[PDB]
Every structure is written in C-alpha cells, then in structure tokens.
C-alpha cells in the first residue's frame, strides 16, 4: 500500500505511494545494497543502433500523454483524446512522434522534479526551455549553447534553463555534448611532472587537445565545447570569453585569501545527460540552475583529486596542519566556504549556502508528499559534503526510485563513437 | 563473479566477491532503494515462541563450524571433523547446541567484523569476551554488567568488551536489556513544560519511573539498568555511580564553555542488540568500544532532538545566529567538537576524532578486501556527521550486505513482552 518514512529530527511520518510508479530494476540487488555507487546501470541509458521497438514506444507514449493531460487542474478530455490518437497515428506512420513544445516544457520540469540527486528541486517549475529540436549542424549547436549560457548567466542573476536538441532517431545520428559541464576548467600535466588546473579533467583536456584545441597551460582555462551533431564526429568550439562570468575568491577577513589567486565560474550546467520521456530519448539537453556553495568551496577546492587547496589554507591560518585531531581541516574548509559565499555575494552572483538549501529541500519534499505521495530522493547525494547532521536532510529517511520523465547518465561518447575519419 | 568498486579520491578499484556469502533479502527492493532507512527489517531479528526448526539450525551450525575451523592458519581436520559430529549429535539429542568459548570468541569478533555500520572495525580482533551464558537471575545479569563496565572503563583507558548472556532457547525465556545503551542519560518533561536532560529518552525514562525508579530531574542523570532474565519481567537496577566515568566539557580557549555545565560519559556501549551465529541467537550481549568525537560533539549535543546546544554556543561566540548563510552553525559545531576532544584528552579518556577514524577505516577496508575480497559497509553510517567529503570514506564506493555471524537490532522489548504481573 505505502512505504512508511520517518524524520528522526521531528518524529514526523510520511507515507510513500509514488514509488509504485517506479520503472524497471534499480541499482540495489536483494541480498546487497549498491546505494553508494556513483554510476550504476540503473541510472544510465546507453546508445542504440536501431529505432525503439514500437511495442515499447507506444505504451510509454500513451503513458506520458496521460500524465500530461492529467496534470491540468481543469481537464480537457477532448484534447486529451485527440492527442492520444494523433500520437498513435504519428507512431504508425513515422515510427516515432514529436512532442508539442508544451509537452516538452512539462517533461523537462517533471524530469527535474524526478531527479533523486537534486537538492534544488523546490524550483522545479521555474525553468526556461529552449527548443533546438530542429538543430542540424555543430555550428548551430554552438550558437544555441552560447544563447543558453548568455540567458542563464544574466550578468550574475542566474536563471534556470535547458536546451533540447533533436531526439534520438535510429541511434546513429545522436546529438551529444562530449563535455561533462558546459563550463569547466582544463587540467594539464606540466613538464616538471606537476598538475596544473583541474586534475579531474586531465584526460578530457588531452582529448580536446587531440582534436585541435590549443592548450593554454593556465590554472583556470575554460575548456572548449566538443559538439557532436547528427551522429557526426565532434567539433571543437572555444566558448566566447565574454559569456563566461567568473568570481574572484576573497575572504571577508583574511586579506591573504585573495593571494591564493583562486576563482570559479558562476554557471553550473550539466552537458552530458539524457532526457527520457514518453519513450523518446534526448541525448543532448544541457541544463543549468545556480550553485550551492559547497560544490565549489568543498568539492572543487578541497577534494584531493581536484584543486586540493585545503592544506595551503591550513598553513595560512597557521593551524596544526600536521595533527588531524586538531580538526584543522574542519576550520579550514569552513573559511573556504565563507570565502565562496562572500565572493559570490559581493559580486552579485546568485548562490545558496547548503544550510538554506537543505531547509529548502525539506519544504519541497513535504510539498511533494502532499502533492503526490512521494519524492524520489538519494540521501547520499542530498546530504551536503560538510556539516551533514547539522542539516535537516540528514535526519530525513528517503526512498530513491526512478520515475519518468527522467534525466539519465550516458556512456562516455568517446567509448562508443564510430569515427567517420 | 565480482562487483567492481571504486574510490574516486585515488581512482583505486576493488573487486568484491564476499557479497556472495550474503544472507537472505536486504532492505532495498528492486525498483526502489531503502538505504537511508534506520531500522529496516533486514537488520532486525525479532522474537520467537518456539525453538528453531532443526532443518534450519543444523545447516547453519555446520556452516559456522566450517568457518571457524577454516579460520586457522594451520588446519585441524581431525578436530574439525570431531566437532562437526559432536554438534550434530548435540542438536539431535538436545535440539540445539552450545558453542565452545573459543568459537564464541571467534563469533563475537566476526560479528563485529561484519557490522556494516561500524567505522572502528580495524580493532575487530581486539575484543575481551565475558562468558555469562550460565547466568540465571537479573541480579546476576546486573553483576556481570557492572564487571563489564568496570573492565571496559579502565579508569579512562577504554578497552573493547562484550558480555554474552544465555542464548535464546524457546524464545519464551529471553535474556534482554531493555536499555539501548548501558550508559545513557534520562530526559524529563518538567512542570513548566520544558524538557530537561536527553529529550530522546523521555519515554524510556518514564518507563524506568513506572517500574519504580526514582527520577532525579537532573540534566545528566544516568538511567538505571532494566534487566530481563530468563523471560521474566524486567527489574530496575541503578548503576553504581563509581562505575560511571564522566568528562567535564571544556574548551582550550573559550573559558565560558565550561560555564555551559556540560559533560558526557566515557563509555559507549550497545545494550539491546542480538548476536546471531551458527543458527543460535543471543538476545542479550552488550558490547562496547570507545567514542569517536562526533557522536558527542555533533549528535548528542547538536541534534535538535537531543541536547540541542548549537544556538547557545553560537551566541556565546557572538555569531550571526540569525543568518544561516553566515555559516555560524559550521563554526559552532567545530568548536564543540574541539571541546569534546580537548576534554577527553585532558582527562586521559580514550577517544578518536572522525578524521583519524575515517583513515583508519580505509586501511581496514583495504586489509579486508585483501584478506577476504570484501567488507560489508554502510556508507550512510560510515561517513561522519560533519565534514563528509573531507574524510576519505566519503569518496569510497561500498557494498552493504548481511553476513553471519552478525549483530541485529530487535523489536523494542516492551512491545512484545508478556508480563507475568
Ligand atoms: C535552481 C538551482 C538548482 C540548484 C541550487 C541545484 C543544485 C544541485 C546540486 C548541489 C547538485 C549536486 C551536484 C554534484 O554533487 O555534483 C545537483 C544535482 C542535480 N541537479 Fe540540481 N540544482 C538546481 C537546478 C537544477 C535544474 C534546473 C535541473 C534540471 C532541469 C537540475 C538537475 C539535477 C540533476 C539531474 C542532478 C544530478 C547530477 C548528477 O548526477 O551529476 N538541477 N543539483
Ligand atoms: C574500538 C572502538 C570502536 C569505535 C571507535 C567504534 C565506533 C562506532 C561508531 C562511531 C558507530 C556509530 C554509532 C552511531 O552513529 O550511533 C559505531 C557503530 C557500530 N559499532 Fe562500532 N566502534 C568500536 C567498537 C565496536 C565493537 C567492540 C563492536 C562490537 C563488538 C562494535 C559494533 C558496532 C555496531 C553493531 C554498530 C551499529 C550500531 C547501531 O546500529 O546502532 N563497534 N561504532
Ligand atoms: N548546481 C548544480 N551543480 C551540478 C552541475 O555543475 C557542475 C559544475 C562543475 C563540476 C560538477 C558539476 C561536477 N563535479 C566536477 C566539476 C549538478 O547539476 C546541476 C544542474 C543544474 S544546477 C546543477
Ligand atoms: N562508539 C560506539 N558508539 C555507539 C554506542 O554508544 C552510544 C552511546 C549513546 C547514544 C548512542 C550510542 C546512540 N545515539 C543516542 C545516544 C554504537 O556502538 C558502539 C559499539 C561499540 S563502541 C560504539
Ligand atoms: C562514493 C560516493 O557515492 C561519491 O563520493 C559521493 C557521495 N555523494 C555525493 N553527493 C553529491 N551531491 N555529489 C557527489 O559527487 C557525491 N559523490
Ligand atoms: C535518516 C538517516 O538514515 C539517519 O539520520 C542517519 C544517517 N546516518 C547515521 N550515521 C550514523 N553513524 N549514525 C546515525 O545515527 C545515522 N542516522
């Protein structure tokens, strides 16, 4: 009937029934849980070489259409019935179908609403949709993307947006962004053997270089867009610098913080995921929202395999960086998080602290259970990378399932691509 | 063949094969993950009213015996074969069997080694075992427990120990400790409506009172031991105060911290779990190790439903406790964690910071994969309640499964107990 869920901070109980609408299998087996796996098959939708079998497509198409018309406060059975028939006919005559802009807008928001790992979902209905389903070349992809970046950045007043490129046809003409994020810094292995920039993008940086991109050997070089249009080999496009808004990192007290020469970009945008809806698949649909402070202050700056600045900040603060029990790491990361927030704020760039975001998500989750008896949530991703139990989300039990529409991961494009030359 | 596991901080890969030895089902379904559920049935072993069916017991008994003799570096097939036969005969003639002290010692350590939620498992082979399987009355239970507490506390130099009471027979003569922990503070609802003490023990405190315990209405009143022996109604036993070592909370810089009038006990001991081994069940087997600083500094002191001192410390530090984005909560909890560590250290009481414990667990996990191709681990419990990604455990993918021997949760005793009077 329903899965009982409890919040141990308030004692409040919630009943989940939405999980019944969950899709196929999902990560965990029976005798073992695989909850902490970053990229499980259950969250990945791979490549195809043939259209989607009609026996599978039709049912899903009907389901989505029913969900769409069911969302209206004041039903429209005539339109609903008409659309149902039109979709079927289109599927029979073309072997697939096109969504209306309206249905697409609905699908992108629902997919967001259904993202288990997203803590900013209280904003789910506030999303600008750019329809690029008529895109044809890489150059056009590049133009659409530049327009998306410009719109979303809005000189610091960040706006959530998503650009939808052509849906997968036979799977041999996929539109794909080989980048992970629209804006990301390069990483290089210098002659002296040290790593400069974002150590996590060493391979991808080399790929861009192999494709002709000119390496700049800087600590914060914005990687180029690697765009694959209509199944053709990817083409490199440098992002126009004017479109990349950045924030110089400063601390409200430590004047030496700026001396670290750090900065980060204002726009967090996923470039490599796939939108699944009503049987259709969109391999190219970059989307963005705004940053949560910890992503930069904690992961980007403090992960040992990223910029790894924790120790340096420790010494600057003159802490016992040689004695773990001193908890110097905790004191350092806090000042770094303060720097990030202080800087975005001073430069008028939208950002949200993890505390405010956690409370925000709690309100959302409660709205969702009230609205539809459930909220797919991945505790492991929702709990911030610092001060876990200090946030309310930590004490909230959650159920993680895959609904539809949904945003899936994909297999790295360079692993399955069939080069033309 | 094996489940691939990855550490994204080092890129290291591990192959898990041990999960094949996992037991029945476990929390997660197929279409949904229930990883963040605190007390799932998969981790609970409830009450019985009849002995264990021989068809089930024998197989498990044989399995355990094989595991025990298999653990020796220099095998002893003759003893192994002899024991196998002796156990079978005992099962046929008595309908159950008794473990040797040696096998029991092995079982308690393996069960610990198999605790997915324990971060201190690198110490798994260092455990003192107290055999109280011949215990008969509550008074004797009380004496054994006092001896355990005294031994473990060791004037601050904490030692890990476990006391094993009689195994479950027909399920109608269960030995049970109604407390959750051996040492825990009471919580009271005062006449003025405020809560004093540990708000989380309000109900259990009332229960002790209902059973005759005299409430002291203090902020740190050690709850009495509620002991159920041989299936009989529980009897209340106050813990002799000399046996409870406590640490007064002080901060190395903030002289006003001591003014908060806080303290905590030195001994963390689970009192209500069940030890399962070779088909046998031990409903009463309290065990202890030593504290990890965050348990007290973060959960006990900062959980809103516990002592909830975060805001007060915030004001004392003169922080913008009215502006979440100031990250005052992060600064407060850090100083509290420093206080806890500083105090235990100053009073010579064993304790370990969460950073040192995380690295310690990483070494353990690596020893385990090398030793037996696996390590049941619950990411959600292993990652400290503060500074998550700052610890290495956060970047380590893990598989959570239930092996055997194992420590299970139980249904609250007052929910199934059949009162004699
Ligand atoms: C409005 C502001 C938003 C905020 C503050 C927010 C914040 C976050 C954060 C902190 C994460 C964790 C990312 C990581 O750990 O790498 C995340 C993940 C995610 N978000 Fe949101 N989000 C927002 C908007 C959106 C929008 C507009 C979409 C899509 C339409 C979306 C889709 C997702 C998805 C799919 C993930 C998972 C990403 C992955 O698996 O790597 N979010 N978000
Ligand atoms: C030697 C020092 C040890 C340390 C530092 C340690 C630390 C911890 C910590 C921090 C937790 C989390 C508890 C919570 O969040 O409430 C935990 C859980 C656990 N530990 Fe250990 N532990 C140690 C020894 C042991 C021993 C001796 C046993 C048993 C023989 C054991 C069994 C467990 C079990 C079963 C859990 C799960 C408890 C639950 O589900 O509530 N640990 N331990
Ligand atoms: N706030 C968000 N954060 C992320 C995407 O942004 C980035 C930017 C850089 C990096 C990552 C993610 C992943 N770690 C390596 C570097 C996840 O998805 C979304 C979607 C809308 S807002 C948003
Ligand atoms: N270090 C440990 N911590 C815990 C048990 O100790 C306590 C003490 C008090 C409280 C809890 C746990 C649970 N939260 C409420 C109050 C879990 O189990 C063990 C086992 C050996 S060491 C150990
Ligand atoms: C192994 C683990 O799954 C991985 O480190 C984690 C946990 N949670 C996360 N949570 C978020 N939000 N983003 C993340 O990258 C990760 N990675
Ligand atoms: C809902 C969630 O499962 C519960 O808050 C958590 C997460 N992890 C924990 N981790 C530990 N070690 N101890 C805990 O009590 C909890 N509770």
From Swiss-Prot, chains A, B:
(6R)-L-erythro-5,6,7,8-tetrahydrobiopterin binds at residues 36, 299, 380-381, 394. Keywords: Calmodulin-binding, Cytoplasm, FAD, Flavoprotein, FMN, Heme, Iron, Metal-binding, NADP, Oxidoreductase, Phosphoprotein, Ubl conjugation, Zinc. GO terms for biological process: arginine catabolic process; cellular response to cytokine stimulus; cellular response to lipopolysaccharide; cellular response to type II interferon; cellular response to xenobiotic stimulus; circadian rhythm; defense response to bacterium; Fc-gamma receptor signaling pathway involved in phagocytosis. Induction: By treatment with endotoxins or cytokines. Induced by lipopolysaccharides (LPS) in macrophages (in vitro). Expression in the liver oscillates in a circadian manner with peak levels occurring during the late night. Macrophages. This is Nitric oxide synthase, inducible. One of its GO terms (cellular component) is cortical cytoskeleton. Polyubiquitinated; mediated by SPSB1, SPSB2 and SPSB4, leading to proteasomal degradation. Heme b binds at residues 118, 409. The gene is Nos2. The keyword Phosphoprotein applies. Belongs to the NOS family. It is found in: Cytoplasm, Cytosol. One of its GO terms (molecular function) is metal ion binding. L-arginine binds at residues 181, 290-291, 295. Produces nitric oxide (NO) which is a messenger molecule with diverse functions throughout the body. In macrophages, NO mediates tumoricidal and bactericidal actions. Also has nitrosylase activity and mediates cysteine S-nitrosylation of cytoplasmic target proteins such PTGS2/COX2. As component of the iNOS-S100A8/9 transnitrosylase complex involved in the selective inflammatory stimulus-dependent S-nitrosylation of GAPDH implicated in regulation of the GAIT complex activity and probably multiple targets including ANXA5, EZR, MSN and VIM. Zn(2+) binds at residues 28, 33.
């Amino acid at each position: 009937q329903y899965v009982r869920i409890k919040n141990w901070g308030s004692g409040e109980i919630l009943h989940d029934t939405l999980h019944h609408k969950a899709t196929s299998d999902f990560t965990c087996k029976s005798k073992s849980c695989l909850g902490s796996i970053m990229n499980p098959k259950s969250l990945t939708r791979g490549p195809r070489d043939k259209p989607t079998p009609l026996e599978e497509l039709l049912p899903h198409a009907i389901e989505f259409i029913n969900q769409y018309y069911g969302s209206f406060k004041e039903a429209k059975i005539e339109e609903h019935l008409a659309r149902l028939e039109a979709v079927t006919k289109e599927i029979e005559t073309t072997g697939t179908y096109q969504l209306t802009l309206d249905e697409l807008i609905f699908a992108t928001k629902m997919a967001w609403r259904n993202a288990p790992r997203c803590i900013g979902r209280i904003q789910w209905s506030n999303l600008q949709v750019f329809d690029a389903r008529n895109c044809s070349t890489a150059q056009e992809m590049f133009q659409h993307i530049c327009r998306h970046i410009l719109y979303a950045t809005n000189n610091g007043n960040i706006r959530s947006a998503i650009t939808v490129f052509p849906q997968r046809s036979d799977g041999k003409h996929d539109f794909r962004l080989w980048n992970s994020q629209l804006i990301r810094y390069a990483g290089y292995q210098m002659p002296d053997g040290t790593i400069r920039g974002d150590a996590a993008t060493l391979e991808f940086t080399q790929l861009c270089i192999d494709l002709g991109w000119k390496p700049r050997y800087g600590r914060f070089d914005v990687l180029p867009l690697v765009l694959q249009a209509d199944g053709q080999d990817p083409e490199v496009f440098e992002i126009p610098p004017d479109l990349v808004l950045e924030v110089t990192m400063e601390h409200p007290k430590y004047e030496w913080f700026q001396e670290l020469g750090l900065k980060w970009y204002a726009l967090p945008a996923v470039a490599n995921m796939l939108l699944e809806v009503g049987g259709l698949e969109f391999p190219a649909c970059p989307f963005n929202g705004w940053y949560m402070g910890t992503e930069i202050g904690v992961r980007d700056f403090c992960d040992t395999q990223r910029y790894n600045i924790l120790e340096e900040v420790g010494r600057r603060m003159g802490l016992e960086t040689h004695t773990l029990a001193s908890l110097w790491k905790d004191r350092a990361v806090t000042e770094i998080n303060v720097a990030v927030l202080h800087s975005f704020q001073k430069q008028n760039v939208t950002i949200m602290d993890h505390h405010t975001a956690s409370e925000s998500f709690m309100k959302h989750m409660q709205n969702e259970y009230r609205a539809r008896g459930g909220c797919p949530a991945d505790w492991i991703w929702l709990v911030p990378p610092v001060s876990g139990s200090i946030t309310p989300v930590f004490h909230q039990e959650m159920l993680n399932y895959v609904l539809s529409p949904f945003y899936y991961y994909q297999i790295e494009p360079w692993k399955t691509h069939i080069w033309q030359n």
